[PDB]
Amino acid sequence: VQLVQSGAEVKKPGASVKVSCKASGYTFSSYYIHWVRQAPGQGPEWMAIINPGDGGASYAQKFQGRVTLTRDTSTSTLYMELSSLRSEDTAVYYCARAEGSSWLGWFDPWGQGTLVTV
Amino acid sequence: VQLVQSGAEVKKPGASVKVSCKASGYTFSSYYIHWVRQAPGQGPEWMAIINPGDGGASYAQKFQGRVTLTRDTSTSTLYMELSSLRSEDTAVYYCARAEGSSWLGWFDPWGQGTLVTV
Amino acid sequence: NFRVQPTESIVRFPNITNLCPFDEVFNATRFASVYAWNRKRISNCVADYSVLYNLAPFFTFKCYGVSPTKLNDLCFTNVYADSFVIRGDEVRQIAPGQTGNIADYNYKLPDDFTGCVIAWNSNKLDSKVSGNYNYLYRLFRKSNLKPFERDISTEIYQAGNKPCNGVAGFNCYFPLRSYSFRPTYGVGHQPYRVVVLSFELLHAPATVCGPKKSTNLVKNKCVNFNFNGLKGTGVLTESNKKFLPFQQFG
Amino acid sequence: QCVNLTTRTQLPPAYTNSFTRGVYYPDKVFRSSVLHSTQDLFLPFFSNVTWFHVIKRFDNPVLPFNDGVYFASIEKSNIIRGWIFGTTLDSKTQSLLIVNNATNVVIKVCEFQFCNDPFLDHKNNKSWMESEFRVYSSANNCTFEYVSQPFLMDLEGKQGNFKNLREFVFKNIDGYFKIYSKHTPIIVREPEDLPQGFSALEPLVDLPIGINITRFQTLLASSSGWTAGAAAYY
Amino acid sequence: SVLTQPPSASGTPGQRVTISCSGSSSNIGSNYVYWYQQLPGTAPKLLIYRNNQRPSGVPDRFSGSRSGTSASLAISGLRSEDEADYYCAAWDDGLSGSGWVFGGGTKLT
Amino acid sequence: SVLTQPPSASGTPGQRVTISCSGSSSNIGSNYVYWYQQLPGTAPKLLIYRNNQRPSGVPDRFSGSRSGTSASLAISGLRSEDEADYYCAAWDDGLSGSGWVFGGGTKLT
Ligand SMILES: *[C@@H]1O[C@H](CO)[C@@H](O)[C@H](O)[C@H]1NC(C)=O
Ligand SMILES: *[C@@H]1O[C@H](CO)[C@@H](O)[C@H](O)[C@H]1NC(C)=O
Ligand SMILES: *[C@@H]1O[C@H](CO)[C@@H](O)[C@H](O)[C@H]1NC(C)=O
Ligand SMILES: *[C@@H]1O[C@H](CO)[C@@H](O)[C@H](O)[C@H]1NC(C)=O
Known part of the structure; x- marks a missing residue:
């Protein structure tokens, strides 16, 4: 009934950084998953919305194609593999939960986030 | 028609001094009084404005709170009190008449002044 | 076919030469407080808003609906003269869309506001050495007011959930607060006299405007110089026909 | 303040044919020694018009206003001072006024502390005097104010040989309020019906209020014993 | 569009101020808004649904509303917490x- | 501002010497300027009024005027006094x- 993140550190720019958080609690096939990035000293930017099961994905304009996400059901892991890291890509990621079979509405509580710096 | 001053001696550091200069001639209750101090190696700076009667004074930013000002009509003595006297404040204090109920204008001739040293 | 073309040219409607009493609502000695702002629907005379460069520190001169270059040429209808005395820091939040302690509880502007505001320094004029505790503003109220609304009531604010009536004390605060104005205060804290205009080109027929231009008199010439007026060309001569006092044209 | 004068009653008003009255100058664009046709609001020829008479007779009736009204007050005593163009008069909607007392010609179109029937006339009965003077404690919502030349009025009054004849035309078009008048102080006859004759009406004033009015009154200027002069209006 | 916000929100303990987001057309007047508060050192937490009801339960001293293309939240009983x-x-x-x-x-002071 | 002045004004008797005070914005442009003479051993005196006239009496050789954001004073006929x-x-x-x-x-020799 909670989500915890994974540990990481500083990486070289222009490389691939693996980020993940687990998922547990209620049933899995009928609850959408949100991920959102937040920069310190500013407002957060919305990252992605994911449908489990078939693993449907959608991405924003500023991150279309330059970021890759994967998902699974039995192991219940949610991966991104960041590439092309700038000084803009130093922020904290959060993985979330949605209403279920709908991407409009209130946001269920996030995790503890993952900080990434270059 | 002339302004006379008082006397002062060497004072202990970090103390309070009091200067009162008697004024004769023009109207005591309808003339502002400018208080200045003259130091060797520098020029004179304004530090207090005296409105007779209620004693409503508008001190500068560097002279607010540290200066106690009292104006009356019966005794006709303009009380000025300075706190936290150091070696920097050793100067000759002058009290002068003004236009009266108006700040902007020329300056009346000054008194002989009272020298304070620490 | 040949034809003669006119030389100096204009058309003849403007004939005005009217007096316009002003510079007393703009350069007065006594002015209204923050919440005591009064309305003068000015419909008296020409009211030239362009000849205002005698006073140098007119730092607030921006206008949104109209430009100052094309201000005194068109006609407005029911302009409002609203004057109040505030600090210099509150001048920047008079513009619509701003937020502050005066933009929600004392006097607020609509988002479709027509007109602009004129402000200037008045510290030497409005600041005594003992202070001028006569211009006062209200900070506490039950709810935010509508734009163009005046509040006069001085009832004790019930900030807390304790029953008090009349007598102040704990959680019962006085809403009206007097300004502490001194001549030694810095920029933005001095008393600044503020005047704002609201042209409001709606509803009624237009009443307040004036071009007030003039030209010369050159009899019997193929020109059109005509007091900068209403359309129509030709030549101008002397005619001996008689008009009644209310007659204009022929 | 409000007074319960009450005594609301109605009388049958006499009807008299108005022959050729109410012809005024249409526009301020002119011409000489010609004939021209205008499609405007006029008083139709040989029509009929009510006749209200003042004797122990009181009359300030309710009169409906629609697209301009023509008045013809024939009188020597000059009781009539103005007209109130108000439909509610409870200080929520704007009402007109024509009151200029002695020398000040200020006209204030405003909402005062006026009741349903705020009288403005007489004093010690028959004499001509101010409307309880102080009529409002303070101004709350005032709209329009305008001072003009004082109208031709005669002090006190005289009964018989009604010299004064005030013809008025009131119009309200697209917010503009237009007043037309031909003041002819020359008649020595019996009052009776309308006099036979023709006379144009020049404009005097136009006022840009911007409101519409459909209801108006008149401002004729103790319990036992009433003495008043004779008057008539149309 | 960009959802302009004031840089800070001034306040003193024991009074009511309003904080507002001004947006463009088809962003605030079309869909609902969501208010969020970020406590230092903690994950962010939801505080309101669409501004007609409270999600789980909060004292009603905070009130949210919409006006045209903007949204506003009035807060009272301000504390240092x-x-x-x-x-x-x-x-x-x-x-x-x-x-x-x-x-x-925005920053609350 | 600071109102800088030259430390000394070297000159000879019988020669006109000009002293210049450099001001800043909103100090010389709109505000009136005063020139004061400090005398050794006695009280300072009102040397001159606003730059048109004399306080009580002086020859017109003492000249003083402002220009731009600065002020200047020309003094001729220098004596021992x-x-x-x-x-x-x-x-x-x-x-x-x-x-x-x-x-x-300043310092006059
Ligand atoms: C007039 O009569 C009504 C009927 O009761 C009453 O309510 C009202 O107060 C009266 N007004 C005056 C002024 O007498
Ligand atoms: C017109 O006036 C006559 C009086 O001459 C009257 O008998 C008749 O009823 C009036 N008609 C209308 C419609 O008022
Ligand atoms: C006319 O107005 C003046 C205003 O100066 C006033 O003094 C005078 O009493 C007024 N006269 C009246 C109301 O008859
Ligand atoms: C005449 O005026 C006086 C003034 O107080 C008044 O008391 C009296 O009732 C009046 N008489 C008549 C008949 O109006």
């Missing part, structure tokens, strides 16, 4: 991208 | 304090 950063989130539906856009940044 | 120093005074209307910031300090 509640000094935090306030954010607003909305569905944008703009040209070339329709993500969950956020506001600017 | 004229050996003194001068100061420039102007209203300040500055940020956080509106007292009387005077000029610097």
